[PDB]
Amino acid sequence: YSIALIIPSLFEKACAHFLPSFQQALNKAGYQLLLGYSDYSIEQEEKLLSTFLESRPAGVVLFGSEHSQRTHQLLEASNTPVLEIAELSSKASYLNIGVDHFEVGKACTRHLIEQGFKNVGFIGARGNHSTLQRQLHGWQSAMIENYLTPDHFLTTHEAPSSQLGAEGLAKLLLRDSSLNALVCSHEEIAIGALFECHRRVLKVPTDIAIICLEGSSMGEHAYPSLTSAEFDYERMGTKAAEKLLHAIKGESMGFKLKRRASTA
Amino acid sequence: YSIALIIPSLFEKACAHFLPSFQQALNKAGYQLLLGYSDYSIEQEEKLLSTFLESRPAGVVLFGSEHSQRTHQLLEASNTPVLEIAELSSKASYLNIGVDHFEVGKACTRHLIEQGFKNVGFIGARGNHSTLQRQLHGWQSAMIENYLTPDHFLTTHEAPSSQLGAEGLAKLLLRDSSLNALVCSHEEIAIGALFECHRRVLKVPTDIAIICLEGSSMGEHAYPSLTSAEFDYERMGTKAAEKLLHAIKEPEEPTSMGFKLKRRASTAIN
Numbered sequence: 001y002s003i004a005l006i007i008p009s010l011f012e013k014a015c016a017h018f019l020p021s022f023q024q025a026l027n028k029a030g031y032q033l034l035l036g037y038s039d040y041s042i043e044q045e046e047k048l049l050s051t052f053l054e055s056r057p058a059g060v061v062l063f064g065s066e067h068s069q070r071t072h073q074l075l076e077a078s079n080t081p082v083l084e085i086a087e088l089s090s091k092a093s094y095l096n097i098g099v100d101h102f103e104v105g106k107a108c109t110r111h112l113i114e115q116g117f118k119n120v121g122f123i124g125a126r127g128n129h130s131t132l133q134r135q136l137h138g139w140q141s142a143m144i145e146n147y148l149t150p151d152h153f154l155t156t157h158e159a160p161s162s163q164l165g166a167e168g169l170a171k172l173l174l175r176d177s178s179l180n181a182l183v184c185s186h187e188e189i190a191i192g193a194l195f196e197c198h199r200r201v202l203k204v205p206t207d208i209a210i211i212c213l214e215g216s217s218m219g220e221h222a223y224p225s226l227t228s229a230e231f232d233y234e235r236m237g238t239k240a241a242e243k244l245l246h247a248i249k250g251e252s253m254g255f256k257l258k259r260r261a262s263t264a
Numbered sequence: 265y266s267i268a269l270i271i272p273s274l275f276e277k278a279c280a281h282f283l284p285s286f287q288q289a290l291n292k293a294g295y296q297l298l299l300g301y302s303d304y305s306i307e308q309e310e311k312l313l314s315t316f317l318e319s320r321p322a323g324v325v326l327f328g329s330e331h332s333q334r335t336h337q338l339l340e341a342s343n344t345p346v347l348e349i350a351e352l353s354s355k356a357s358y359l360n361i362g363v364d365h366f367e368v369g370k371a372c373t374r375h376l377i378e379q380g381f382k383n384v385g386f387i388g389a390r391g392n393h394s395t396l397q398r399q400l401h402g403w404q405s406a407m408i409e410n411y412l413t414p415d416h417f418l419t420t421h422e423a424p425s426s427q428l429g430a431e432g433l434a435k436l437l438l439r440d441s442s443l444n445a446l447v448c449s450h451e452e453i454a455i456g457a458l459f460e461c462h463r464r465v466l467k468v469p470t471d472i473a474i475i476c477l478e479g480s481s482m483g484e485h486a487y488p489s490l491t492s493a494e495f496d497y498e499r500m501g502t503k504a505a506e507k508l509l510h511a512i513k514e515p516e517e518p519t520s521m522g523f524k525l526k527r528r529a530s531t532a533i534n
Contacts, residue, residue, distance in 0.1 A: 002315075010283060016274050020303050032315060035299060039284050051266070051296050055319075163485040188482065191455070195487040198462060218452065221427040223459040 002032035003059035003244065004052040008040055011159060013187070013216060014085075014233055015063070021237025029245055031059065046071040053078055059244050065090045065130070081247040083240060088130070095243050097236060099253050101131045101213075104229050105138025107257055108211050109183055111227075113146050115263055117181035117209040121152035123168035123193065124185035125160035132185055135213055139183055152176060160185065165192025166199075173200075181209040187219050190226055194262075210262040224261035231255050265322040267508070270300040270309055272327045275423065277451075277478055278349070278497055279327070285501030293509050295322065304393065310334045317342055323508050329354045330394070345511045347504060351398070359511055361504050361519050365395050365477075368493050368523055369402020372475050373447055375491070377410055379531055381445035381473040384416070387432035387457065388449025388477075391419030396449055399477055403447050416440060424449065429456025430463075433472075437464075445473035445531075451483045451492070458486055458530070474530040488529030495523050 003026065007015050023033035034057075036048035046068050052060075058080045065088040075082050076091055084090060087098040112120050122139050124132050132155065140150040152175065154168045165184060169192075172179050184190040190212040197204050204210055204224050212219050215228025236253060267290060271279050287297055298316060302308040310332045316324065317338050323345035329352055336355060339346050346358045353360035376384050386403050388396045396419060407414030416439060418432050429448060433456070436443050448454035454476035458468060466472045468488050476483050479492025500521060507519070 010274055010280050019274055019301055023301065024303075032312070033301070034315070035301065037283060037287060037297065037299060039287060044287075047296065161485070162482055166485055166487075191482075192485055194459075195485070199487045218426050218455070221425070221430050221456055221459070223463045 001030060002034055002057060003061070004034045004036065004049075004057050005061045006036035006038055006045060006048050006063075008038055008063045010037075013214060014231075017216075017233035018085075018237040018240075021234035022241055025238045025241045029241070031245075042066060042068050050074065053080075056080075059248055061085065061240065061244065081244060083244055085236075085240065086130075087134075095247055097240055097243065097253060099231065099255070101134040102138040102141070104213055104255060105135035105183070106142045107138075108213055108229050109139045109142035110145075111257065111259075111263065112181040112183070112209055112211060113142060113148070115181075115209060117205070117263070118146075118148055119152075119176070119179050120148070120150075120181040120183060121172045121176075121179050122150075122154075122183040122185075123165060123172070123189050124153065124155040124183075125158060125164055125189060126185065127155045128157040135183075135185055152179060155185075160188040162188050162192030162195065165189035165194075166196040167192075169193045169196040180207065182211070184210065184212050185214070187212050187215050187226075187228070190215075190219055190228075191222060194222055194224075194226070205262050205264050215258070220258075220260070227258060227260040227263045229255050229257050265295075266298055266320045267295045267322040268298045268300070268313075268316040268324040270302055270312060270316075270324075270326055272302055272304050274301065277480060277495075281497035282349070282501045282504070285498045286505050287501075289502040289505035290509070293505070295509075304390075306330060306332045306335075310338075313338060317344075323347070323512060325349070325504065325508060328394070345508065347508050347511075349500075349504065359507055359516060361500060361507060361521070363495060363521065363523060365398040366402040366405075368477055369399040369447070370406045371402075371525060372477060372493055373403045373406035375525065375527070375531060376445045376447070376473060376475060377406065377412070379473065379533055381469070381531070382410075382412060383442055384412075384445040384447055385432075385436040385439075385443050386417035386447045386449075387419075387429060387436070387453050388417075388447075389420045389422055389424040389428060389453065391449075392421040399447075399449055416443065419449075424452040426452050426456030426459065429453035429458075430460040431456075433457045433460045433464075444471065445469075446475070448474065448476050449478070451476050451479050454479075454483060454490055454492070455486060458488075458490065469530050469532060479526065484526070484528070488532075490530035491526065491528045491532075493523050493525055496521075 219226030
C-alpha cells in the first residue's frame with residue numbers, strides 16, 4: 001500500500017517543487033512514497049525500478065519518455081498503474097502529465113516581440129534533452145511568424161549556469177551589437193545575463209529586454225526584476241497523485257507568464 | 265542487504281551536491297540506494313525510517329542530530345550502523361561527518377574585519393534549524409572579539425531566498441545606515457543583497473562589502489563576483505559512503521573536513 005517515484009535530477013526545479021506536495025497529498029490518502037534517484041541514468045532508472053517491484057507496489061511515477069525496453073514490460077507486465085511526467089507518453093495506456101514547452105518558448109518570445117523588442121537571441125542549457133529543442137523551436141517559430149530571422153542562439157548539453165548566461169550574452173553581442181532582447185531557458189542563465197548587463201553598463205530593458213522560460217522567486221526579486229514563465233509544481237505535485245489514485249481503482253498543464261521589470 | 269538515506273530538503277546544496285557521488289561510490293561497492301524525503305520533519309522521518317528498517321538491513325544514513333525517540337529506538341534497537349551528516353552526533357555510538365559552521369562564520373567574518381569592513385550585518389535563514397545558529401554565533405564571536413557590537417542581524421525560520429536578501433539589506437539599512445558589510449548565510453540571500461545594492465546604488469564593496477557563507481559557481485559569476493566560502497559536498501558524498509562501507513566491511517575512523525574561502529570582488533580593497 002505504497003507507491004514509488006524515481007527522479008531524474010535534483011537541480012531540476014520541476015522535481016524540487018513537485019516532490020513535497022506529491023507525497024503530502026499521497027500520505028493524506030493512505031499510500032507511502034519509496035522514491036529513487038536516477039542521476040539521469042536510464043540504466044539506473046531500471047536497477048532502481050526493478051528492486052522496488054520486488055515489493056508489490058501498485059502505482060509508479062517517472063519523468064520523461066525515454067526508458068529502457070528492458071523495464072517497460074516489467075511495469076507493463078506486473079501491471080501496476082504508471083504516470084509519466086513529460087509531454088510524450090511512451091506506452092500511452094499509462095497516465096500522463098506534461099507541459100508544452102514549445103508553447104512556453106513561443107509565448108515568451110511572442111511577448112518580447114509585441115514589445116518592440118524585435119532582435120531576440122536565445123541562450124539555453126541542458127540541451128540534448130527533448131525540452132530544450134522544443135523551446136528553441138517555439139522561439140524560432142515566434143520569430144518567423146513575425147517575419148524575423150532566428151539567427152542568434154547559443155546552447156550546451158551542460159547544466160544551466162550564470163557563467164553560461166554571462167558568457168552567452170558576451171558571445172552574442174559580439175556577433176550582433178544590435179541584439180536587444182534575450183530568451184533564457186533556465187533562471188540561472190538569466191541571472192548571469194543580468195549581471196553581465198550591469199558589468200557592461202547596459203540598461204535593461206532599454207538596452208536589453210530579458211525573459212526566463214522556467215522561473216521562480218529568484219528572478220522575482222532580481223534587479224531589474226525578471227519576467228518569467230512560471231509553473232505550479234505543487235498543483236502538479238497534487239494533481240499527479242489524484243490521477244494515480246483515481247486510477248489504482250476506478251475510472252495540458254498551463255503557466256502564468258509573469259510580466260515584470262525586464263520588459264516595460 | 266540495501267542501504268537507506270533520508271534527505272531533509274531537496275533545496276539544499278549539501279544534499280543536492282552530496283547525493284550523486286554518494287550514489288556512485290555506494291554503487292561501485294554494489295549497494296542499491298533506498299531514500300526518503302522529510303520536509304525537515306523528525307516525525308515523518310519516523311513514519312518513513314520505520315518502513316525502511318522493516319524491509320532490509322545494511323546501514324542507514326541521516327542528516328541532522330535532532331531526531332525521534334522511536335528513531336533512536338528502532339535505529340539503535342536494530343544494531344545496524346548509522347551515519348549522521350551532522351557536526352555533533354546524538355547517541356554516542358553513531359558514525360558521523362559534517363562541517364563546523366561556526367568556524368565558517370568566524371573565518372568569513374574576520375575576513376571583513378581584517379579587510380577593514382568593520383560594521384557588518386548578518387542575514388540568514390532556516391534559523392530554527394541548528395546550522396544557522398552556529399553561523400550566527402560564529403559571526404558574533406568575530407565581532408565581540410574585536411569590540412564590535414554584534415546586534416545587527418536578521419534571521420527567519422523560512423527558507424533562503426533573494427527576496428530575503430533584498431529586504432534583509434533594506435531593514436538593516438533602516439535599522440542603521442552606517443552599515444557597511446553583509447554576511448549572508450546562503451547564496452540566494454547574498455544575491456538578493458547584491459542586486460539590491462545595485463537598486464539603491466550602493467557600490468560593492470566600497471559602500472557595502474558582501475560575503476556568502478555557502479557559495480557555488482552561481483555567486484562566483486555574479487557582478488561584482490562575491491567572496492564566499494565553498495565546500496566540497498561531492499567529496500563528502502564519497503567520504504560518507506566510504507566511512508559506512510568501511511563500517512559493514514571493520515575499524516571506524518576523527519574527520520576534520522573544512523572549506524575554502526574564495527576571495528573575490530565583494531570584499532576586495534584597492
